[PDB]
Amino acid sequence: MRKQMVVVRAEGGGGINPEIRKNEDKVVDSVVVTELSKNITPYCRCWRSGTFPLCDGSCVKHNKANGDNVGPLLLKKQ
Amino acid sequence: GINPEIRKNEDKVVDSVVVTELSKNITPYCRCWRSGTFPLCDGSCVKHNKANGDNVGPLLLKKQ
Ligand code: FES
Ligand code: FES
């Protein structure tokens, strides 16, 4: 959408992940659950985190800008 | 927007998993907000990806 080479990604389209790992056929991440170190580890469901697949709070910025309500998955040891 | 309809009465939709409670060897959790079994993945991602030229997929929680 909007070619200047540079493609400006204007508007919407149907997608939800404009930027992350676009070279991958399908972005899947795996967690072997015994590898968790903290009691609670938040995982990103918004495709905006700078530490994706972890949540860095970018969801907060996305929600306010877009009138959305997404948030992370909390993996808990206990 | 990312989430069309899930739990709009919540200003921020968060789910928790106590990993010792998982039953399947690999349990897929939805990151696309299209699953009919959200927060689980039911493969709606695949249809979404095809329809919208996207490449999103689940988080897989594995025992081994
Ligand atoms: S940064 Fe994506 S869910 Fe928090
Ligand atoms: S149904 Fe949403 S990630 Fe598979």
GROMACS .gro file of C-alpha atoms and ligand atoms in nm:
model
  150
    1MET     CA    1   0.000   0.000   0.000
    2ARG     CA    2   0.176   0.326  -0.122
    3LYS     CA    3   0.507   0.241  -0.305
    4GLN     CA    4   0.768   0.524  -0.303
    5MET     CA    5   1.244   0.074  -0.289
    6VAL     CA    6   1.021   0.177   0.003
    7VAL     CA    7   0.679   0.044   0.075
    8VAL     CA    8   0.475   0.260   0.309
    9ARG     CA    9   0.226   0.039   0.490
   10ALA     CA   10  -0.071   0.271   0.491
   11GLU     CA   11  -0.408   0.201   0.652
   12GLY     CA   12  -0.518  -0.147   0.750
   13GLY     CA   13  -0.544  -0.443   0.521
   14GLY     CA   14  -0.652  -0.767   0.688
   15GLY     CA   15  -0.325  -0.851   0.866
   16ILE     CA   16  -0.225  -0.811   1.228
   17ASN     CA   17   0.155  -0.856   1.206
   18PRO     CA   18   0.301  -0.591   0.974
   19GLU     CA   19   0.665  -0.617   1.085
   20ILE     CA   20   0.772  -0.927   1.279
   21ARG     CA   21   0.960  -1.214   1.111
   22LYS     CA   22   0.787  -1.162   0.778
   23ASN     CA   23   1.033  -1.401   0.609
   24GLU     CA   24   0.879  -1.693   0.806
   25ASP     CA   25   0.595  -1.894   0.656
   26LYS     CA   26   0.410  -1.900   0.985
   27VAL     CA   27   0.551  -1.745   1.302
   28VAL     CA   28   0.528  -2.010   1.573
   29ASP     CA   29   0.725  -2.003   1.893
   30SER     CA   30   0.773  -2.292   2.128
   31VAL     CA   31   0.833  -2.295   2.500
   32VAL     CA   32   0.943  -2.607   2.680
   33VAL     CA   33   0.767  -2.522   3.003
   34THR     CA   34   1.037  -2.649   3.238
   35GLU     CA   35   1.267  -2.389   3.087
   36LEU     CA   36   1.077  -2.100   3.253
   37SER     CA   37   1.288  -1.926   3.519
   38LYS     CA   38   1.060  -1.661   3.678
   39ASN     CA   39   0.734  -1.765   3.841
   40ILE     CA   40   0.540  -1.551   3.588
   41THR     CA   41   0.659  -1.486   3.233
   42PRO     CA   42   0.437  -1.277   3.000
   43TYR     CA   43   0.420  -1.371   2.632
   44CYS     CA   44   0.312  -1.132   2.359
   45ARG     CA   45  -0.017  -1.166   2.175
   46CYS     CA   46  -0.004  -0.827   2.003
   47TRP     CA   47   0.280  -0.863   1.754
   48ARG     CA   48   0.428  -0.528   1.865
   49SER     CA   49   0.675  -0.628   2.134
   50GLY     CA   50   1.038  -0.529   2.086
   51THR     CA   51   1.120  -0.852   2.275
   52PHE     CA   52   0.873  -1.072   2.086
   53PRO     CA   53   0.774  -1.349   2.171
   54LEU     CA   54   0.786  -1.186   2.518
   55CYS     CA   55   0.557  -0.900   2.621
   56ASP     CA   56   0.735  -0.567   2.671
   57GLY     CA   57   0.422  -0.358   2.733
   58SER     CA   58   0.386  -0.247   2.370
   59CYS     CA   59   0.029  -0.384   2.392
   60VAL     CA   60  -0.050  -0.081   2.614
   61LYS     CA   61   0.065   0.156   2.341
   62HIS     CA   62  -0.126  -0.039   2.073
   63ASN     CA   63  -0.451  -0.049   2.268
   64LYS     CA   64  -0.470   0.323   2.332
   65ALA     CA   65  -0.383   0.418   1.974
   66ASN     CA   66  -0.624   0.168   1.813
   67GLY     CA   67  -0.915   0.139   2.055
   68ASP     CA   68  -0.819  -0.230   2.116
   69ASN     CA   69  -0.796  -0.448   2.427
   70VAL     CA   70  -0.521  -0.706   2.364
   71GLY     CA   71  -0.282  -0.830   2.629
   72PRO     CA   72  -0.033  -1.101   2.710
   73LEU     CA   73  -0.046  -1.470   2.807
   74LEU     CA   74   0.100  -1.526   3.154
   75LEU     CA   75   0.294  -1.850   3.190
   76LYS     CA   76   0.309  -1.948   3.555
   77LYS     CA   77   0.518  -2.206   3.735
   78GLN     CA   78   0.277  -2.213   4.031
   79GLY     CA   79  -0.698  -0.320   1.538
   80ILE     CA   80  -0.590  -0.673   1.615
   81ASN     CA   81  -0.871  -0.831   1.814
   82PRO     CA   82  -1.209  -0.806   1.635
   83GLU     CA   83  -1.436  -0.924   1.913
   84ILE     CA   84  -1.290  -1.120   2.204
   85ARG     CA   85  -1.391  -1.010   2.554
   86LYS     CA   86  -1.451  -0.643   2.476
   87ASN     CA   87  -1.579  -0.586   2.832
   88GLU     CA   88  -1.214  -0.625   2.940
   89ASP     CA   89  -0.993  -0.323   2.870
   90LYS     CA   90  -0.692  -0.555   2.854
   91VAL     CA   91  -0.744  -0.929   2.786
   92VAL     CA   92  -0.496  -1.137   2.980
   93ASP     CA   93  -0.498  -1.517   3.035
   94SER     CA   94  -0.291  -1.731   3.265
   95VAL     CA   95  -0.157  -2.084   3.233
   96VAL     CA   96  -0.018  -2.280   3.526
   97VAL     CA   97   0.214  -2.496   3.321
   98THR     CA   98   0.195  -2.802   3.552
   99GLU     CA   99  -0.177  -2.824   3.463
  100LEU     CA  100  -0.121  -2.880   3.090
  101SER     CA  101  -0.254  -3.213   2.968
  102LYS     CA  102  -0.128  -3.239   2.606
  103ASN     CA  103   0.237  -3.283   2.521
  104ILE     CA  104   0.207  -2.971   2.305
  105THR     CA  105  -0.070  -2.717   2.369
  106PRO     CA  106  -0.115  -2.431   2.119
  107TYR     CA  107  -0.217  -2.090   2.250
  108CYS     CA  108  -0.374  -1.834   2.015
  109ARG     CA  109  -0.185  -1.518   1.914
  110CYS     CA  110  -0.425  -1.422   1.634
  111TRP     CA  111  -0.744  -1.339   1.831
  112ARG     CA  112  -0.957  -1.540   1.581
  113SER     CA  113  -0.978  -1.874   1.763
  114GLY     CA  114  -1.321  -2.006   1.854
  115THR     CA  115  -1.158  -2.158   2.163
  116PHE     CA  116  -0.950  -1.852   2.262
  117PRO     CA  117  -0.711  -1.850   2.449
  118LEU     CA  118  -0.640  -2.186   2.283
  119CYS     CA  119  -0.546  -2.202   1.911
  120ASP     CA  120  -0.801  -2.387   1.692
  121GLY     CA  121  -0.617  -2.324   1.358
  122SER     CA  122  -0.818  -2.014   1.270
  123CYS     CA  123  -0.471  -1.856   1.219
  124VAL     CA  124  -0.427  -2.065   0.905
  125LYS     CA  125  -0.747  -1.939   0.749
  126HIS     CA  126  -0.668  -1.582   0.853
  127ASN     CA  127  -0.316  -1.605   0.706
  128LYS     CA  128  -0.453  -1.739   0.375
  129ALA     CA  129  -0.731  -1.478   0.349
  130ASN     CA  130  -0.521  -1.176   0.454
  131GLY     CA  131  -0.168  -1.267   0.337
  132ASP     CA  132  -0.049  -1.280   0.700
  133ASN     CA  133   0.194  -1.513   0.879
  134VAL     CA  134   0.082  -1.531   1.244
  135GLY     CA  135   0.070  -1.847   1.451
  136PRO     CA  136   0.041  -1.988   1.799
  137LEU     CA  137   0.262  -2.013   2.098
  138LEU     CA  138   0.331  -2.385   2.159
  139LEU     CA  139   0.364  -2.496   2.518
  140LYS     CA  140   0.564  -2.820   2.530
  141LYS     CA  141   0.637  -3.076   2.799
  142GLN     CA  142   0.900  -3.270   2.597
  143FES     S1  143   0.381  -0.641   2.414
  143FES    FE1  144   0.243  -0.768   2.301
  143FES     S2  145   0.098  -0.850   2.450
  143FES    FE2  146   0.231  -0.708   2.567
  144FES     S1  147  -0.622  -1.983   1.612
  144FES    FE1  148  -0.509  -1.802   1.669
  144FES     S2  149  -0.295  -1.857   1.663
  144FES    FE2  150  -0.404  -2.039   1.588
   0.00000   0.00000   0.00000
